[model samples]
Each structure stands twice: as C-alpha cells, then as structure tokens.
Target: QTPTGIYYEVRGDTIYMINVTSGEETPIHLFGVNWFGFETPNHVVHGLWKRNWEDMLLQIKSLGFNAIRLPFCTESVKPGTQPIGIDYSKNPDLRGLDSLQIMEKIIKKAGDLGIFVLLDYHRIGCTHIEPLWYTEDFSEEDFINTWIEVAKRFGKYWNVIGADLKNEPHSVTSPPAAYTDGTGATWGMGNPATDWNLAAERIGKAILKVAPHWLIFVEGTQFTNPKTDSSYKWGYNAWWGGNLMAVKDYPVNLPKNKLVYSPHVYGPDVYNQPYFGPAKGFPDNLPDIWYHHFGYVKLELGYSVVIGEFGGKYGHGGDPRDVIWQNKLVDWMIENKFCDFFYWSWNPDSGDTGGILQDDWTTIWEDKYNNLKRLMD
Candidate 1:
C-alpha cells in the first residue's frame, strides 16, 4: 500500500523514508529536541532568532540532533493575526520578515544543516494549548484548514517531514473536576467534536490531498484510562499529553503507515505518578505501568511512536526516581529497537521540566545532556 511519492514506509515496528531518485530506503529515527519559545507569544525564546538563527540550527545539528519538533501557536499563521511581534532594532537579520516568514526561514535553515522539522500546532492563541483542538474562537474546521494551509506552504520542503496536528489534547479529570460531560477531557473516537484520533485521521487525509509527502504525527489524550480500571482509571494521571492506553483499541485510519503515534511523559517533579511508588517496588513495577500508559502502541499494536516530550528536573540531587525514570525510558527505547523521541525542550525557560540548556540559555545542562546520550546515532 505504499504510495508512489510517499516519503516514508512502515516496516515491521519502524518507519523508513524512501529516496525518490535513488530509490534508497533511509531509516527515520527521530532523535531530536523540542524548540519552543518564539513559536508562541508568551513563551518567547529570544536573542538567537535575530542574529544567528541559521547558526543555531547548525549547532543543534552538530550536537547530534537529527530532527527538531518546532512547536508554534496558530496565531503565528492564522488569518488576521499579527504575523510576528519582534523588535527589529534588536534582530536586524529577522527584521523585515514576519512570524510566519521567520518559521519558513528556520525550516529552510534546519534542512541545510541536515535536520528535519516537524511543525507542531502547540496552541491556538496567546494562552496555553487547550485540551481540545479548537477554542471558543477557533472552530474545528479552522483547525484542519490551518494545517492544510501550513502543509501546502511547506509541502515542497522535504525536510519538513510532518505536521503535529495539535499539542496535548486533554480535559479536566472527573470526580472533583466532574469531567462527565465529555467537554475537552475525553479523547476517544465517535465524538467528532473532540476526538483526537478522529481529528488526526480526518485532518491527515486533508493534508495528504495537498501535501502528500509529509507524515502525520497524532498525539494521544490525557484521558487514556478506562472507567473500569478500578484504582487507576483513564483520567488518573491526566496531564496535557500523558495518556495513550486506549490507543490499542482505537487506531487512526490514515493511509498505511502514514501515522506515527506521539505521547508525552514527565518525571516526579512535574507530577507524582503511581509508578513512582515506594522504593521497594523499584524496577519491578515500572514496566507494566509504563506499558499501560503509552508503550503498547509500538510494542504491541505494530504502530510507530515517538516520546514527543519526556524530561526530568535538572541536577542529580532531588529524587533518585527521576534519573531512574530517564534510564528506564531510554533503555526501553533501545531494547524495543530504534524508538524515535524528541526531548521536551532545549530552552532554559522550560519551567515545568528543566531542559538540556541551562539558565544561561546558551550553555547545555551537563546532567540532562549526558542523560540523553543513548537516543543518538
């Protein structure tokens, strides 16, 4: 079922992109970092965007990153929105161009440095990314069209491999929050209004119509637990992009191998989970819980997956469990075979999870940098 000009093909448990003229099947192991900041209005990572944006991409490439998941806001590209909010006096290199144009330049520069880009629709407005794809202002149709237009604009850029339809889709949990109405917290199929799986399939097909070369990466919901799970139900550890346990039953119906599952996970500092149990449980109880949360998609269901975001607090002091989670997650990826992953952020401003970059914004965090050494070539 491989399309004639499709960029990649699914082979067993992995994905490989094909070279058109050469007919070579190049494997795609997305070992990369998530670069946010300027993509959104509030979480602005300044400085380098003005001077050496190209050099920054080059440095990312030099640092053993093969790809970068560029998470941005819909405001940057949507109609009637301010293109970019920049101080031209500060960044003369990025002076004339607007926000959307700056994105184009960054993608082109990354391609030049042998790095692939995954354009992510992180949020709809200046606020945080919502649980649902659209907000009160943005309709679901607009969400799909936004990607269609964005994909068409970057269609020809082969390095622009995919479009992450939306960021973490999650609603508030039940009980105290009472998420009974299926407002934005739920994330299964059948509810066309708020289903991430259905949205991904529907939007992915629309994208292929115009930009057939690009891959479609769909994220899972924060509500992956089933109601019948007794103690730890679907919405238990429900964060922005945490859950995917239900993906085993509901698969995205895009073209063959055109879909890659994405799920985000964090360490103890962010939110203490059941997995971070007493020290006596140790490594014994880790595998089963991890698989239940997000592992089955690739290991059991025969689909590809990327740990789109996973990191812990920096430094080696806080909790011993933090390093354990990192080690176990990386080891699981290696044992499972070329698992693709993009660590949360490269910015110093990742308040929730400290990034590979230090507070200086220029220096790399030694502990976190060395921790991610396994995901490389």
Candidate 2:
C-alpha cells in the first residue's frame, strides 16, 4: 500500500521515492544513521563480535531509521581483505565471505527489509583519515576505481542508493592555502591537484557512466572563502565536510536530478567553536553561521542538501551548551527543510561524539535517540 525500495528522483530540493510501476511519489526525509567500522582495520562493522549482524539490522530498522550511510575504506574492498571480529555462532552466513561479499549480504538484507543504503567511500586506507581523498598508499586513481568498482557491484540493488565519494575532506588550516600549494582538499580553486569540486565531478561522472540511474552525493570542503579576494575575514571555520560557500559560484557538474549536496555539521561536543561562547550570543549565532556555510544551498538555491554527518554526546563530557547546540540544529533543520540527514553514528565507540548506543552496545541512549525522534514528529 506504499512506496518501497530506492526508486527515487530528485526534483528541485526534494527527493521523492516513487512506486515505480504505478508512478506514485512519496517525498523522502532520510532519517538515516551511520553504522561505522566497515572502514576500520577490522574490515567489518563494529559490535558484530558482540551481537548478530542481522539482529543489529533489525534493531536499527525498529528504531525508525529508514536508511544507513554504510562506510568502507579502499582496503575493505580489496582482494584478501577478509572480515574479522564477527561471531560465527551468531552470524554463520557471514563466516566465509570476504569484505565485499559480506557487504553484499548486508545490502541485500537491508534492501529486502526496505532500508535504503548509501555507500560511503570513507577513506583511502583503513587506519587513518587523510586530508584528501588520496594518500601516499592509495592514489587518486585508486579512489576513483574503488568507487567505480562499488558502483558496478552494488548499483543494481534497489536499496543501494549512491556513493558518498569521500568522508570529510578537509585542509590543514581554516581557509586553506591556494590550490597550487595546499596539500589538502580545495573547492572551486581551479587547481587539478587540490580542487575537490573537480575531483568529485570526475569521480561522479565516471560512476554515473557505469550506473546512470544512481544518485551522486557530494560533500562540501572544510573551508573555502566565497569571495575569492582578500577582503573577507580569515578566521571563520567550518566542520570538516561542512562548508559549501563555493557552490553558489561553482556547482558540481552533474545531472540536476541525480545530484545531492551533502555536508557534515557538529556541535560543541565535537569541537568548542568560539561562537558557542556567551559573548558571541551562544546558540543564537548558529543559524547565521550555518547559512554562510551550507544552509543557503537548500534555502535559496533549490538543491537537495542532506547532512551527511551531524550528532553530539548530549553533554556527556563536552560543554553543557552542547545540548542547546544540538537542539537548535535539529530545530533549524526542521525549519529550513533540511531534515534529510544521517546522524554521525550508531556505534557506541566514537570517542568525541558518543553514538546513539552506549558502551554496553545493547542499551540505547534514550536522551540522544529521543531527541532525534523529533525529526519524525
């Protein structure tokens, strides 16, 4: 009696899930969660050693999350990268499979259950996050080929939506150096070496050539001054993968209906930005900051903007204002129609921002889960 699978089409700023044969459309507000550890050295999602993967997926679906932003490293898909840490007694089906095969099983299960999947090429390697998509170990060509391989492998699955090219591509400093000299990612800078915009276009176009029906999710750079000149103040910073100021001038060259602008935002729990201080008006200043950073693309430019990552610890060990910041951001997302998003994680082990679950892995963070449930209401 309703829409199912990933038969979605982007129209203006909205993503509508269509019941394909009937051609009915249901506007999608992605209440998604990040399930980390596929990018980890373990070569599988975390907590599997403690619980059954199928049971975990059932729990995630039962929590009202309709989608998962599943992350993986380049090494995760490579040959001989067998998954470890899974309990065979509980997940016997996952015992003999390599990393990519295990991923297929998970994706197929999620697809049948109506849980949409967004594949995230989280990093080039398994150990650390690099400033750019490529690293000394994996070259730019490797990154692109990995994505192409994934697109070809998983694109046919109805629930496997698209690829998040890279996770949180950032520069070493706020408002990073010029494209020629900068070692990290840049946006709209016109340098073949540093421009994330150009790289995304190249990678996205390549993937689309193979899987034309798939959507392409592109994240913003850490910081890029909208004004190409020196008049703009320099200290302003954004969360890694949170800045989209350049999009106003240089949009990613992809089919409009298959393009989605993704940005990651964090609160005081993740980093104590100066704006959280009382002198700067505390949480009141967030909206203006968000507008200049990534919100304007959705509000004014009529593009689908999904928050690829955003969550906090609810003041567990961070600033008390963390609660205020998190609440305000949620309210802002609702107000601006940027409600489609993926929470930073579902794992309890994230050091800075404790996840939706606690350390026990079996218990849920009611405070965090309840707060995010407002998105549904």
TM-score of each: 0.89, 0.94
lDDT of 1 by residue, 313-357 (tens): 644444667777777777777777636888877765676677776
At residue 283, what lDDT does model 2 achieve? 80
List candidate 2 stretches off by more than 4 Å: 1-7, 173-179, 225-235
- Could you tell me which residue pairs clash in candidate 1? 171-185, 225-234
As a whole number from 0 to 100, the lDDT of residue 336 in candidate 2 is 78
lDDT of 2: 0.82
Give a tens-digit lDDT track for model 2, residues 1-377: 21233455689898877666666778877889999888999999898888888888899989999899999988787767888888899888887899888888998999878888999988777877788978766788988888888887887787877888889888775443534457778887787677888888999999888777677999988755435423223225677888787888889898898899999999888887877787988788888888878888989899999999988888777667878888899889888778789998889889888888888888898878888888866
Best by TM-score: 2
Kindly provide the TM-score of model 2 when superposed on the true structure, using C-alpha atoms. Answer: 0.94
Cα deviation of 305, candidate 1, in Å: 0.9
